[PDB]
Every structure is written in structure tokens, then in C-alpha cells.
Ligand SMILES: *[C@@H]1O[C@H](CO)[C@@H](O[C@@H]2O[C@H](CO)[C@@H](O)[C@H](O)[C@H]2NC(C)=O)[C@H](O)[C@H]1NC(C)=O
Ligand SMILES: *[C@@H]1O[C@H](CO)[C@@H](O[C@@H]2O[C@H](CO)[C@@H](O)[C@H](O)[C@H]2NC(C)=O)[C@H](O)[C@H]1NC(C)=O
Ligand SMILES: *[C@@H]1O[C@H](CO)[C@@H](O)[C@H](O)[C@H]1NC(C)=O
């Protein structure tokens with residue numbers, strides 16, 4: 096009943112789990128899907144769905160949230176936001192299970208979507224967007240998207256406060272939380288956000304001519320330099336949103352009794368970040384990372400090192416995992432190696448797992464959609480910069496996936512490393528999407544050498 | 545007040561679909577699942593299930609029913625019965641779809657169980673059992689199981705009349721409908737029924753020593769005759785129910801504005817029928833058939849010819865489809881070839897599809913559970929006495945399945961034969977059982 100992770104987890108949450116410098120990264124791999132957890136509620140109705148999962152865990156508790164739709168799973172539909180606060184416990188037999196301390200289903204009328212959540216000392220901080228219109232209409236609207244900062248405390252109470260997006264996102268036509276989890280850092284909660292810049296606005300003007308071309312390993316692009324640059328520049332203004340610059344941002348907010356207190360929007364230079372996309376701000380040990388969904392031409396998982404300076408942050412050259420690809424429409428498929436304009440891909444974050452003694456991230460765990468173009472075939476595995484380990488297929492090759500957010504930890508008591516993988520999956524004839532939690536232990540083959 | 549399907553279906557409902565004497569039966573086969581029909585409601589909750597499906601279709605309308613559990617799918621939970629009256633339609637594109645005209649969700653305090661539905665001229669007749677105890681607690685009791693004859697009319701109203709089981713099933717300790725659809729024949733609705741007989745009751749006495757042994761095609765049981773005969777006899781009184789003879793029966797009720805009118809329970813001789821099990825009363829063309837779930841030692845799909853005469857039925861030696869097996873626990877697994885005593889298997893009916901010119905049945909469509917012992921891997925196909933055509937697996941090999949009921953019809957316009965396969969299935973991460981309708985066209989290597 097303790098409002099903290101059970102003693103066995105103490106000291107095994109949020110840190111660098113494995114630091115092997117000698118042994119290969121891919122030698123570490125996911126086992127068979129263990130103790131199928133049930134902290135995530137199934138959809139309220141049989142014809143409805145659960146979608147857009149966000150999870151973040153600190154050394155004391157975890158936070159989880161998801162959007163629920165009563166009929167169908169089409170975005171242009173009414174939805175409720177489910178938010179929960181919980182801790183990692185063990186049974187008498189050592190069985191790991193996610194225990195919910197508090198939970199709330201926002202059954203009101205506010206149209207919350209693209210919500211992200213973060214574990215803070217005060218509980219579970221949530222960043223949501225509120226809109227009654229279309230997404231493609233939002234980038235077509237003149238005003239920024241409404242956003243709110245909420246919190247489900249340890250006391251079960253929920254408080255929320257709408258942000259003054261008029262001034263905070265004055266340079267944006269559309270703005271949304273990255274859906275991925277946010278991170279608590281130096282008294283502030285950091286949520287990755289994305290959207291469209293108002294053309295010719297101060298923010299849009301500062302990003303003019305700014306771009307970056309990330310290459311694939313051992314697979315260079317055959318297109319000429321002049322053309323690649325031309326394509327990279329256009330990747331920030333995909334035709335889908337009519338020329339608007341799809342921008343990546345970072346929003347920090349002070350964690351205190353007052354919600355939405357002192358919000359500061361940092362917009363990293365596009366010479367670092369690719370096209371704005373869904374993302375996640377996480378902290379593993381002492382380093383911070385910004386996961387960016389590969390919505391543009393870049394297929395391999397991006398893990399941007401994030402450093403903090405007061406209320407703003409700076410992103411450095413991203414860690415890339417070539418094998419950890421994501422499905423996408425041509426010319427931005429899983430094998431795409433050339434810069435291009437597109438709004439595709441799927442959110443499938445990599446959790447910093449293996450590090451060097453010097454703390455440089457060496458390997459990550461994540462449930463990728465092992466598919467070339469279609470959002471399907473989820474598979475858990477460990478990936479370094481170029482390869483992947485023995486995979487643990489979530490289900491069949493027919494399983495459609497929309498999101499996979501992974502968070503790994505250790506049971507210091509048994510010294511075993513585990514990875515929680517929350518996936519929004521569905522089969523062709525079993526119903527709409529539903530979020531399912533999968534826990535897998537990270538193994539290592541010693542008898543190899 | 546027949547609502548009528550679509551002019552495209554006239555002459556193509558409940559008829560002999562494919563009449564051929566030359567073409568190899570297995571040359572006919574199911575295509576890919578054309579579409580995923582929407583007439584069947586998903587479980588009301590995401591943590592519950594839809595189970596025990598029943599379906600019957602007549603010239604002008606179809607009837608469908610399933611049981612719904614709000615939390616989980618424990619057969620020992622409170623539930624409500626969903627009943628629907630519908631029609632076979634077709635969009636401008638020519639896309640087949642089942643339109644549900646009327647539907648009611650019986651959510652009272654009664655425990656309807658093992659319901660069977662039938663499309664009658666007055667609507668959708670449902671035969672349910674009303675229980676207050678478990679399967680075993682029921683067979684141990686002295687009194688028969690309560691049953692009710694109900695009906696969803698074209699007007700949307702549902703009327704129900706509990707049958708006088710005390711007299712109707714006086715010789716029974718437990719009795720339930722076969723779950724499979726019932727059929728309208730000669731002014732009355734016919735429902736397969738099964739349960740356990742009261743020891744020494746007249747019905748039981750008449751069955752003493754009666755048994756029948758059905759062999760596999762080219763898989764002769766090596767057991768000595770005396771041993772087989774003893775096993776066959778014992779198969780009727782499996783240990784599961786402490787020696788109570790599990791009997792197959794047939795209930796016919798007069799179809800009229802008065803429910804439960806003139807009930808007549810027929811109990812076929814166990815020299816014809818194997819141990820009582822879930823079943824269905826089908827009518828294809830002028831012929832009638834009784835499908836009996838292979839709950840005993842017999843694995844191949846069974847279709848007993850059924851002839852009716854003044855309120856009573858008569859079953860004959862059944863058509864068997866050797867490759868249309870079903871999974872079962874040992875020693876009555878799908879590969880079984882010898883008589884034995886057991887209560888296993890799963891409901892997976894064969895729909896009469898291909899007939900000889902003379903009307904003798906030869907081929908059927910069905911969605912079998914392509915497994916040996918576990919209720920997994922549903923797979924649709926066309927079957928004859930010894931073979932299986934090319935298949936269309938419904939899902940993965942680890943897909944669970946509790947029931948599959950198929951009904952084939954024909955679009956007279958495009959003259960294409962289709963088969964509705966309604967299956968209660970589940971999968972690993974996607975929750976409890978759920979009834980899903982599947983539609984496949986019947987094709988041929990010619
Ligand atoms: C930690 O040690 C590794 C040694 O493998 C360093 O990796 C090298 O880093 C240099 C420059 O960053 C690269 O040019 C080499 O290609 C890397 N070699 C390998 C095998 O990765 C890493 O930079 C060190 N990290 C820190 C923070 O000192
Ligand atoms: C319809 O035709 C079939 C085809 O012959 C008949 O089935 C045959 O019946 C004879 C009985 O003399 C046996 O050789 C076999 O049972 C069948 N033979 C073959 C080659 O299949 C069937 O009996 C006919 N139906 C009726 C009602 O007469
Ligand atoms: C059945 O067995 C006989 C031998 O008794 C054989 O000639 C025939 O080909 C077999 N048929 C099949 C389908 O195996």
C-alpha cells in the first residue's frame with residue numbers, strides 16, 4: 096500500500112542498467128514475454144479503443160496515461176483521458192506487477208488529445224492539447240492550439256490549468272504534446288512538443304535555411320548533394336500541411352502547487368532536429384534524451400542528447416540505431432536512406448539500456464514495428480548503432496501497431512533487468528486498437544565466449 | 545410479416561447450393577475472407593465476451609443470438625442474451641451485408657443459457673435454458689432444467705413462455721438447447737436438445753444397451769469387437785456426470801402467436817445417435833439434418849439425415865466427413881478411431897453445400913478447429929466424406945475458438961455461392977472470446 100516502489104526496485108529505477116564495455120551490445124536480448132501485466136485498463140467498451148499511451152517512471156513511482164474512445168477509433172471522435180499513478184511491486188514469489196495508487200478518467204467535455212505524462216515528486220504531470228477541430232484544419236487555423244497542464248496527485252486529486260498559448264505559442268498555428276513521456280528535471284517538467292510555425296513569424300524566420308542530413312550506416316544516398324539538401328529543406332515543410340514548417344520543440348514548466356506555472360518554450364535549431372514529430376523526454380541516470388518519432392525521411396530511432404540550462408534546453412547530435420527502423424510510406428520506408436519530404440512513420444521509442452563506463456549510450460531496448468511500410472509486426476529487441484539482437488515478436492505478423500513506449504528497470508534485489516513495453520495493438524478481426532503492457536527480461540548469452 | 549432480404553437473394557436461401565455429380569467435391573474451396581461483416585455486436589465491455597453463437601436463416605430473414613458477459617468470460621457469471629432479427633442485403637457495389645432490423649438485449653435476472661435461435665415465419669424463435677446452478681450441480685439435481693421458448697418478432701417485441709419442463713423433460717435431470725440453430729419445418733420449430741436422463745426413467749429404460757459405433761474411413765479400430773461394444777456403450781454414460789446417460793433429443797414446438805405451444809420431445813434411439821451433445825437442426829432444400837457436436841469419441845463432423853412426421857423426428861445413419869475433424873482431449877482427440885468414454889470436442893457445424901443430382905449430400909463447408917487436442921486454429925474449408933479442400937485459416941495457429949457455425953447462401957444475381965462462418969474466437973493480447981462473422985465465396989478449380 097506504500098506510495099512508492101517496493102524495496103526490491105529501490106535503486107533500480109531510472110539509472111544506467113548495464114555498462115558492459117567488452118561484450119557486444121546485441122548479445123543482450125529480450126526473453127519470452129513474461130508476466131503479462133494488467134495495470135492498463137482495457138477499452139471501456141468492446142467496440143471502442145484505448146490509444147496514445149504515455150508512460151514515465153521516477154525512482155518512487157510511475158505515471159501512465161491513455162486516450163479512450165467509446166465507439167470506433169477514429170480521431171474525429173469524442174474521447175476520455177485515463178490518467179494513473181502507480182508503483183512497481185513484487186508478490187511473495189517475486190512476481191513483478193504494476194500497482195496503481197491512484198487513477199482518474201477525465202470523463203468531462205474537454206477534448207484532450209496527444210497527451211503526455213511525467214512522474215514528478217508531486218505526482219503525475221500531464222500535458223494535453225484541447226481542440227474541437229481537425230488536425231489538418233489546426234495547421235490551417237490562424238491561432239495556436241490550446242494546451243493544458245494537469246496533475247493527478249498522490250492524494251488522488253486532479254488539477255488542471257489551461258496555458259496562455261496565445262503568447263506561449265504565438266508563433267504556432269498548430270502545437271501538440273509529443274505523446275511520449277515527459278521528464279522531471281531541476282524542479283521543472285519537460286515535455287517534447289511539435290507543430291506548425293506561423294509563416295514569417297520570429298520562430299519561423301529563425302529556422303529559415305536550417306536543416307540537417309542524417310545518413311544511414313553502410314548505405315549512402317545515391318542522390319546528388321544539390322538534390323539531397325533540396326529534399327532535406329523541404330522535409331520541414333511537407334505538402335500535407337501546406338508549406339507550414341513542422342517544428343520540433345521542448346516545453347519546460349515549473350512543478351509546483353500552481354499548474355502551468357512559468358512555461359518556457361525552447362525551439363532547438365533545425366540544424367540539429369529533423370521535422371517536428373511526436374517525441375519523448377526521458378532521463379536515464381544523469382543524461383537526458385529527446386526521442387523523436389521518425390515522421391520524416393529518417394527511419395532509424397533518434398535519441399537526441401538533451402542538456403538543461405535553467406528553464407531552456409539544448410539538443411545535440413542524436414544517437415542513431417540503424418536496425419531500430421520504423422515502417423513508413425515511400426520514399427520514407429523503413430529502408431529509406433535519402434532525405435525527402437513526408438509525414439509518415441510510427442512512434443516507437445528506444446529506452447537507453449546499455450552504456451559505456453564513460454556513460455556514452457551504447458545500446459537500447461524498444462518494440463519496433465518490423466515492417467517496411469505498413470504499421471505492423473511489433474518486435475522487442477536490443478539495438479546498438481547498427482544491429483539488433485534476437486527479437487521477441489509481440490504477436491503475429493498481422494498485428495497492427497500505432498505506438499510502443501518502452502521503459503526498462505532493474506530489480507536490484509535479484510539484479511535482473513526488465514523492460515516494460517506498452518503497445519497500442521490490434522488484430523484484423525478482434526476489434527479496434529487497445530493498449531497492452533508487456534514485460535520482458537533482458538538476457539545475455541555467456542556461453543557464447 | 546416477412547421483411548424480405550433483397551431481390552438478389554430469392555431462390556438462393558436455404559437451397560442446395562452446388563449440384564454436381566462429376567466435379568471432385570474438394571475441387572470447390574473457400575477464398576479469402578471477402579469482408580468482416582458488422583451485424584454482430586462486439587462485447588458491450590472491453591473486458592467481457594460474446595459467446596455461444598446461434599444462427600438460422602429462412603427465405604426472408606436471418607436470426608442471430610449470442611450470450612454476453614460484462615466482466616471476463618467465466619461461464620459461471622451473470623449474463624444477458626442478445627437476440628437479433630435481420631435481413632441479407634447488398635449495396636450498389638454488390639457488396640453483401642447483413643442488416644439487423646430488430647434486436648433485443650434480455651438483461652433481466654434470469655440466467656438464459658445455451659440458447660438456440662430459429663428463423664420462423666413469425667420472427668426469431670429462441671429456445672433457452674434458465675439455470676441457477678452449475679453444469680454438474682444440474683446433473684446431480686432431481687428436477688429437469690428450466691427452458692423457455694421466446695420470440696423476437698418483426699415488430700421488435702420479444703415474448704417468452706417458460707416450458708413445462710416438469711412434464712416435458714420429466715425423464716431428465718439436466719437439459720439444454722443444442723446452441724446451434726433450430727429449423728422451421730411443417731408449421732413447427734425444431735431444436736436439437738441434450739442433457740442427462742434420470743436413471744431408470746422410461747426414457748432411460750428405452751435406451752438401456754442401445755449404442756452405435758461409427759468408424760473412420762480408412763482407419764479401422766484394432767480393438768476387439770467386445771471391447772469396442774463395451775466402450776461404445778460406456779460412451780453414453782461418461783464419468784463427467786456420474787453415470788447419467790447424456791442423451792441427444794429433438795424438441796419441436798408449434799409456431800404460433802402462443803409461445804411454447806404443443807411441445808413434443810423426441811428422443812432418437814441410441815442405435816443411431818452418439819452421446820448427447822450440442823447440435824443444430826438444418827434444412828437445406830427439402831432435406832433436413834441434425835448436426836451433433838463430437839463431444840464423444842467420434843471426431844469427423846456428423847450430419848444425421850432428419851425426416852419429420854407429425855411433431856416427431858427420425859434420425860438416420862449420418863453423413864460423416866473424415867477430414868472435418870475437431871480437437872478433443874485424449875483419448876477422444878481429433879485422430880481418434882475407437883469407441884471411448886469422454887466429454888470433449890467443440891461445436892463446429894458443417895453446412896450442406898454440394899449435392900448429387902438425386903439430392904444425396906456429398907460436400908459441406910465449415911470452419912473446423914485445425915488441431916489435435918487444443919481448441920485452436922480455426923480454418924474454413926469445403927469437405928466431402930474423406931477430404932478437405934484448400935483452406936482459409938481465420939487467424940493465427942494459436943487463435944482460440946469455442947464455436948463456429950456456418951450458413952451458406954447464394955447471390956442469384958451474380959450466381960456466386962457464399963458462406964457465413966460465425967466464430968467465437970480469442971487471441972493472446974486482445975482480450976476474451978468474441979464472436980466474429982466471416983464471409984467467404986466458394987470457388988472451384990474449374
Ligand atoms: C567512451 O569510450 C568510447 C570508446 O569505444 C568512445 O567511442 C569512440 O568515440 C570517438 C569520438 O567520440 C569516435 O571517433 C570513435 O569511433 C568511438 N569508438 C567507438 C568504438 O565507439 C566514446 O566517445 C567515449 N565516450 C565518452 C563520453 O568519452
Ligand atoms: C445418388 O447417387 C449416388 C452416386 O452413385 C449414390 O451413391 C452410391 O450408392 C450406391 C448404392 O447402390 C453405392 O455404390 C454407394 O453408396 C454410392 N456409390 C458411389 C460410386 O458413390 C446415392 O445412393 C444416390 N442417391 C439415391 C437417393 O439413390
Ligand atoms: C482407402 O483404403 C484403400 C485400401 O483399403 C485404398 O485403396 C484407398 O486408396 C484409400 N483411400 C484413401 C482416401 O486413403
Ligand SMILES: [Ca+2]
Pocket residue numbers: 681682683684685686687688689717718
Ligand atoms: Ca437439474
